[PDB]
Ligand binder design. Structure first.
Ligand code: ATP
Ligand code: ATP
Ligand code: ATP
Ligand code: ADP
Ligand code: ADP
Ligand code: ADP
Ligand code: ADP
Ligand code: NLG
Ligand code: NLG
Ligand code: NLG
Ligand code: NLG
Ligand code: ARG
Ligand code: ARG
Ligand code: ARG
Ligand code: ARG
Ligand code: MG
Ligand code: MG
Ligand code: MG
Ligand code: MG
Ligand code: MG
Lengths: 126, 281, 283, 126, 126, 283, 281
């Protein structure tokens, strides 16, 4: 089990910007219907590694454009989200992305006021 | 010399909405009366000259009905919406675009401004999709998308847009769209300051009967309760729903006003009282 | 074979680059719009010219479309030297048919063909200002072009929209006039300093003999066409057609052609080959 | 209680962009004086539902502009934040927003170095 | 210990935009090699306090441009990150920033599929 | 009644659209600035003209404001044919009063009225280059306009700022000159190809008789005003006032008016009505 | 021919800050001396011609004091700030804007460049609010906001801005603002590379007495400690505080330099040593 135990988790994926459409499409296929994205900058500088973006080289300190995906789901569907993101986003090149999993204590739909499981459920996911 | 001291007093009212977009839906008794018609035109032109960015959206029911009965294919309405087969659709587009639209454009051109009349087809301004009751109604449309691109340079050149409420789906089939709907969704697309609908009543009434119970100002939560409680009914329900729909999308205010009143448009914008009901976001 | 088709595409190169960036006024005549397949074929040709680097402006007519509605509404129709006698009732109908049916039909077809069109009448942006003809007592609300203001077309073309022009307009007082679509196309070509004016119609071109479709005159000058009018060889709707070529050529338009809109891809045959596809008039 | 127990929680609200001023104003009124917002894109596609934005229709996979609000507070004031956001942001239309609640283990003010409760406290909240 | 106990934490720092290069450089020096930043707006309105940005004054409700830094690390290196950010970002003026610490249940590298400690480790941090 | 007031607003339409987009140079005379209420009333009229689609440029004077400071500082003052005799000490004081008091007072009033102004002297952006007058030995540092460079005004107007112009400038060597505010307003109107020059002062307009405020000449031509100067009917500060109309009209400015700045909304009465509010001079 | 080999050697110094904005506050002994005055003007013009984007901000105390005593309303100062009632305010604006500002602008115009002189009123460049000690000081202001909009096209056209330190609040009341404050806050608004203050001392001294203990370079944390420890005092405390204030807002460097030195501005920018104390962010 995920060590801080919780009813919900947020899957936070920082990936290449041009892969967002494909990952979103694939997530939709397995019933993931709530997704948030935003433009970010980052670096993930392992060892001496050099990353390519816009035909240019980026080492250590130098920032590279990325997109952050945020998906909030029940504990049980967390693995499917991670795997779906990996398949959709992976190129095999340095700089493919990092995923984080964070505990979420509650979910609330603004329109209705539904809390918890009812708020997380989208009426078309199987 | 009283004419200029009045002009001077309207300064703060003129300044308030400078550079702001305003979407006005013209229909009803304001259409059928030549005197009211020239007042609307006047008011539009004044607003344009005074620094506002008005857009006129029209319907034109009575004119359509006349040609339909001339052709022995008389009108059929279900809950305020016209049953529109392929033959009716052709006549609808003929009247709205070829008669009404160009009538308003020419009146504006003669009033010392310059208008450009467009339908949803032009510059792909609107894309339609079949309405939920399309099985009964035929080629009646909802707005699937607005592309306001074409309006950008026209407004920049100082033309007044005049919009006819027909458009096509993606395959090229023409649809008949409710003008209130077009006005509301167009306002949402432009991030308009105001949506203004001209109707045949004083505004939204507390009691369906007496016109002295007119509500001046109310919010989304307010009128949504008025629908549920049954205090508002009939043809006024679709109007309020279009107001809520555009308000929810970022339009600041939506007004339902009395088109029967001379210069109602100017009254709504240039006075604190208004000319009907203001609904706020 | 695929190997042969591709080399034929590349053989069109010198023809594509010859009028690159040039303004061409294409008038699509009402008489040519005989089929839905032919309508979408013609807009295909027009769209192709835009994608290939030319600047086409579409003007259209709609005589037969109008005539059909006059019949249905029980209104008598009359023409004199190719111009419709237009009373007040007919004006309204002319405007509704041309702007509300034909204009939006063509705009709609262009939007479905991978391009975007904007439909305008003379009213819109004050593109055209009309004026009554001298014989108003006989013709009624038939207009001449008093002014062209091409301003509204500049931002539309700058944005990549193909304009589609209907031939109704008003005078300065707001009275509506019916202008023959040939006359409009010719004056618009002059206003835009167009390289070419091309008129699609329902015959091979200017015929020496109306009865004989093989008496096609392949090319002719201003002197020659003026003589055909005086000799009576040119009659009916071909008079305004021929007259709009004379007037636009005189104002600096380089060539004017009259061609058969019912022949498949005739617009392309006219521009993209040495033979052309009908009659070319030159100065 | 919120299941992962914590001294602080982050209230994360994804809402309509034109509602931010009103929600911020209302939060200020009840003593919420630290707020972070950012521009995001998202979809929340229930069932067959269609969402309206800019006069256009958005179904499933298609992204819509939103704003993300982040408010970090003590456990006890979490309910007031949620409720205040809902009242300020709700229109009653599809696409009104989702709120998430996440545990926060610590808060630190950069200027002073104050940790925990002192760092969370803003000298004007009652 | 950080009260919601976890193998990883996300350090979330909202700071002045012109300090990002310096903080990033300093983090790189102590072996922090994964960093995400994004443009945000915020207010932190203590008491009657007035904040200066672009030569102008900002009180209460009025939003100010900031940058959000996100750094995910093992529990033990959390203090070094916080301290490094504070030294690099502090001016001593009102509006220097807030830092939040949130539990993270897992880390995954997209390119390889490495989970947990292997995914968090960057081959050049001592 | 509210129903009547709104229709009166809409009655101003033809008057609003008549000079839409036209440049109007408005000179606000020192003698007219007799009250704080009248100062903010005049900027109200000026702001109204901008919001309504005109392009007003404000030039101002400040004779009485200067005179008050000369009195306080114990410096004698003298005028000859409406021009201040200006020694070195007086120049400094002229510049500080006109630029530092009056200019910023008006700029400040405009900013508080829902518009934004930018105040400039002839120095700024090299808007004006001065030159000594022939009778320097008598007048001292009194300048004529040698050059106008309107360049700095282009981006300011493009951004929607109302320029407010003070009438001091330097020659090319950097020596400061006092230029009469009428002269500046007239040469600026010529430089901008202005439709109108309107001068607000402390009398009804040009009077046939100085003593009799009912001898208002409602309109007059260049021949007529030249005669009034020669006959001595125009004297004192009215000489440069009348002369700046002659000079600007000769350079293509279409009309010039002299009106009473102390009458409420007189600027509006002049532009937005057929009668006007004083004297109009035409070519 | 030594003049051109020197010019050639200054190349890397000229290239370094090309396109960068530089905010220079002119006052003190650099004002009172005609020789130093023309050197500052020269230096400004050179910087502009060489590709930098300089902005000059001035005060002008001595000139104000002179007119105040001519008018029998002599100066009153509290902790370096002038007590400014309505009458004094009028004289302050008269001198700073009508004398000093236009003097500098005309000198620049005669030096072969072109200047535009502005106060805080012009284009609403500054909005003031009452200073914390306003009860004692009257119409003395802090900068409530900067709107640098008007400077954008002026700099694009190649004009040199020259700024007088008066402005109004939102109601239209004029305020007297400290020129250092205006320079610092203006630098913050423009995201300026540098803030440069001309003073009557060598820079920041380790010991208040001897001018040989001048600190070349120090950071925010460094000088903030120097204030607390009392190593810096008097009129130098407000100066450092304005430097910190703009540094904290993103200005890269802030220099306090010796205005008594010929060509001090050029020395500060065109040499590695500088002309006083550089404070870094
Ligand atoms: N520890 C971290 N904390 C915060 N953000 C991170 C972290 N690691 C990576 N990121 C974000 O993820 C982005 C892309 O992943 P990145 O390539 O850096 O991972 P990596 O561990 O270096 O794997 P790879 O060896 O495939 O490059 C970075 O640019 C950064 O924005
Ligand atoms: N499970 C989720 N994970 C991440 N982000 C989400 C999730 N659900 C919603 N969002 C974000 O919130 C936004 C708006 O809320 P949304 O309308 O999608 O909620 P909903 O559950 O569909 O409720 P409604 O039925 O009122 O539409 C989305 O566009 C998306 O950015
Ligand atoms: N409680 C909070 N929740 C969410 N974001 C916050 C919170 N507090 C601060 N922030 C973000 O951090 C930014 C800057 O820190 P800020 O100056 O507001 O902290 P502060 O507590 O007011 O400390 P200071 O007294 O130094 O100003 C804010 O603009 C806001 O974006
Ligand atoms: N509370 C209400 N206030 C105003 N009108 C109402 C209310 N309830 C019902 N109505 C009716 O709704 C109708 C809406 O006008 P409608 O005829 O649809 O306008 P149009 O013909 O211009 O579209 C009114 O004629 C009115 O009789
Ligand atoms: N010499 C000629 N050559 C060809 N066509 C002619 C000639 N004289 C008259 N016509 C007539 O002119 C018609 C074309 O004009 P018109 O009917 O107005 O069609 P359009 O819609 O193209 O204007 C032809 O169909 C033909 O009947
Ligand atoms: N014929 C005349 N008609 C009107 N005013 C005249 C005439 N001749 C001289 N004047 C004087 O000219 C004055 C206006 O000029 P001036 O005093 O310079 O005021 P301003 O500040 O408007 O320049 C009037 O107040 C009046 O005393
Ligand atoms: N450490 C220090 N270094 C330099 N000057 C100092 C220091 N401490 C105090 N001062 C004093 O602060 C004053 C600051 O100069 P000031 O007269 O305010 O300049 P200005 O008149 O140009 O505003 C100096 O005159 C100096 O005597
Ligand atoms: C569907 C429908 O009723 N369309 C309308 C358009 C006119 C209007 O909205 O005013 C119609 O009368 O046919
Ligand atoms: C005057 C006139 O002939 N108008 C034409 C316009 C249409 C066309 O030319 O095809 C008509 O038929 O009514
Ligand atoms: C030379 C001259 O007369 N200058 C004027 C300028 C001010 C004004 O015209 O009102 C003066 O009074 O000093
Ligand atoms: C408040 C205050 O002292 N303002 C100054 C402005 C001059 C300056 O800053 O140099 C003054 O002397 O009145
Ligand atoms: N209830 C109303 N009709 N209110 C109208 C408000 C009028 C105001 N001048 C505006 O247009 O915003
Ligand atoms: N008889 C003709 N139609 N000739 C057409 C000439 C063809 C040539 N490509 C052109 O447009 O210029
Ligand atoms: N005697 C006069 N002042 N006549 C003024 C004519 C008014 C007219 N509206 C104008 O400016 O052109
Ligand atoms: N302590 C100093 N004054 N240093 C000045 C540094 C000089 C350098 N050329 C610059 O302007 O950035
Ligand atoms: Mg990496
Ligand atoms: Mg014909
Ligand atoms: Mg949703
Ligand atoms: Mg704060
Ligand atoms: Mg005078």
């Amino acid at each position: 089990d995920y060590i801080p135990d919780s009813k919900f988790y947020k899957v936070e994926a920082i990936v290449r910007p041009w892969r967002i459409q494909q990952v979103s499409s694939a997530l939709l296929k397995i019933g993931i219907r709530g997704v948030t994205v935003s433009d970010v900058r980052g670096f993930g500088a392992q060892g001496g590694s050099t990353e390519r973006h816009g035909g240019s080289e980026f080492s250590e300190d130098k920032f590279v454009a990325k997109v952050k995906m945020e998906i909030v789901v029940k504990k049980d569907q967390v693995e499917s989200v991670i795997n779906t993101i990996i398949e959709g986003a992976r190129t095999g090149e340095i700089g493919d992305g990092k995923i984080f999993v964070l505990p979420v204590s509650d979910v609330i739909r603004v329109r209705t006021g539904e809390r918890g499981e009812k708020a997380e459920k989208m009426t078309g996911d199987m | 010399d009283y004419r200029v001291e009045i002009l001077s007093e309207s300064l703060p009212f003129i300044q308030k909405f400078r550079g702001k977009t305003i979407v006005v839906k013209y229909g009803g008794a304001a259409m059928t009366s030549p005197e009211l018609k020239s007042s609307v035109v006047s008011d539009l032109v004044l607003l344009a000259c005074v620094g506002l960015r008005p857009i006129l959206v029209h319907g034109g029911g009575p004119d359509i009905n006349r040609y339909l009965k001339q052709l022995n294919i008389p009108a059929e309405f279900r809950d305020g919406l016209r049953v529109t087969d392929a033959t009716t659709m052709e006549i609808v587009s003929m009247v709205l675009v070829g008669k009404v639209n160009k009538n308003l454009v020419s009146l504006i051109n003669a009033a010392g401004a310059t208008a450009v009349g467009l339908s949803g087809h032009d510059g792909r301004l609107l894309t339609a999709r079949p309405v939920p009751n399309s099985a009964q109604l035929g080629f009646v449309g909802e707005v699937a998308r607005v592309d306001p691109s074409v309006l950008r340079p026209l407004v920049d050149y100082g033309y007044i847009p005049v919009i006819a409420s027909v458009a096509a789906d993606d395959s090229g089939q023409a649809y008949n769209i409710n003008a209130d709907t077009v006005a509301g969704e167009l306002a949402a697309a432009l991030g308009a300051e105001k949506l203004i609908l001209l109707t045949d009543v004083a505004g939204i009434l507390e009691n369906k009967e007496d016109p002295s119970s007119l509500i001046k100002e109310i919010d989304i939560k307010g009128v949504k309760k008025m629908i549920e409680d049954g205090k508002v009914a009939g043809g006024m329900i679709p109007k309020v729903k279009c107001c809520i729909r555009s308000l929810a999308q970022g339009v600041k205010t939506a007004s339902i006003i009395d088109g029967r009143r001379q210069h109602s448009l100017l009254h709504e914008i240039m006075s604190d009282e208004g000319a009907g009901t203001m609904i706020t976001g």
